[PDB]
Design an enzyme around this catalytic site. Sequence first.
Site, PDB file in Angstrom:
ATOM      1  N   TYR A  27      -2.455-135.156  72.528  1.00 13.31           N
ATOM      2  CA  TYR A  27      -2.154-135.171  71.103  1.00 13.31           C
ATOM      3  C   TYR A  27      -3.426-135.069  70.266  1.00 13.31           C
ATOM      4  CZ  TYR A  27      -3.348-140.126  71.627  1.00 13.31           C
ATOM      5  OH  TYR A  27      -3.997-141.310  71.883  1.00 13.31           O
ATOM      6  N   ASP A 140     -11.017-146.566  79.750  1.00 16.29           N
ATOM      7  CA  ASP A 140     -10.983-145.168  80.201  1.00 16.29           C
ATOM      8  C   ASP A 140     -12.391-144.623  80.397  1.00 16.29           C
ATOM      9  OD1 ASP A 140      -9.760-142.757  81.053  1.00 16.29           O
ATOM     10  OD2 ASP A 140      -9.440-142.021  79.036  1.00 16.29           O
TER      11      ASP A 140
END
EC number: 2.7.11.24
Length: 349
Positions: A27, A140
């Site tokens: 996105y 992450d």
Amino acid sequence: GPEMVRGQVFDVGPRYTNLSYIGEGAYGMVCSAYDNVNKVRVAIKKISPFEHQTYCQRTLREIKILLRFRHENIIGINDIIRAPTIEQMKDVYIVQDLMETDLYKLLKTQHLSNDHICYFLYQILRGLKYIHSANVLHRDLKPSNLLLNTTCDLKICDFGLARVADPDHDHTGFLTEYVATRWYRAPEIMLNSKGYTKSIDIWSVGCILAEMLSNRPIFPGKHYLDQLNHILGILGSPSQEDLNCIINLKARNYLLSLPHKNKVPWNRLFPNADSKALDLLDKMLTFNPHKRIEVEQALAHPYLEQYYDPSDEPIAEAPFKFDMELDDLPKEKLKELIFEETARFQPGY
Ligand SMILES: Clc1ncccc1Cc1nnc2cc(-c3ccnc(NC4CCOCC4)n3)ccn12
């Protein structure tokens, strides 16, 4: 018209021009550009999250966190662009100073000297020390989120998966599952999927260190459940003590049913590596998350002693608390919060 990059409109003119593709996700997309006002090269991350609550949560967190961080080893936000009214806002553009490359790209073309591995690892953990001191989990860390210049300055980027976990509260059972990128996922992300801690970041750094030593991912699982088998294929089967620390009965029984694997010695995998690097690697890639080395102890390890200096390693002066966590809200309310957090970059206000 506004400039377009691989079919994505980047409504960032007139100040930012000459857009070039850097990368993309589910996105969002990142481009390089030129800041005509400050006469500097920038990266612009376009984010289009508003149809999904999870995307909105991640957009708000990345913004709130990075706006409050200031640290040499962490990407800063220069500017945020979005529409003047909330109804027109479909996208948010985060502007950052442009770095030359990332560690993922570097490891495709270069074998790193031990000095470069050492210095890069120091900087990772120096930024991580600041992140963890703020009660933030990055969640992450991986080579492509480590940005690099020719001066070998290193900056951690992409806080889309980051969040605050106030240590005054027990977050067991309330943390999002399936975080991190698969090859960099700590075992407890699979065995304690809603109850892990900031030590998953240390595991990721361990995976990055191994990748710097050999230019290959150490645990390249082919799918979610394959990931644990790669980890155990090298660490060997967990000890009885470590098993009985897995609180989830289902996960503990899943592990008890696996065939026994012996540990692969580190210097068999990495026969040319610094023995100090392998010692630190072993402590970062420790199966039990409570025995796994923490960020300050990692910085204090003999491998990093040329660089460790607590007088020159900032920590957050106002660690984040539960107020930074109030985002379990409908996506329409999160869009209002994102509108408010970015208002300080708007003409007027
Ligand atoms: Cl790519 C993507 N797409 C969708 C969602 C998330 C992401 C990942 C992501 N997030 N923030 C960011 C920021 C950047 C950035 C910031 C500053 N300088 C540079 N220089 C490039 C130049 C070419 O070589 C690699 C370094 N990149 C990169 C990825 N970033």
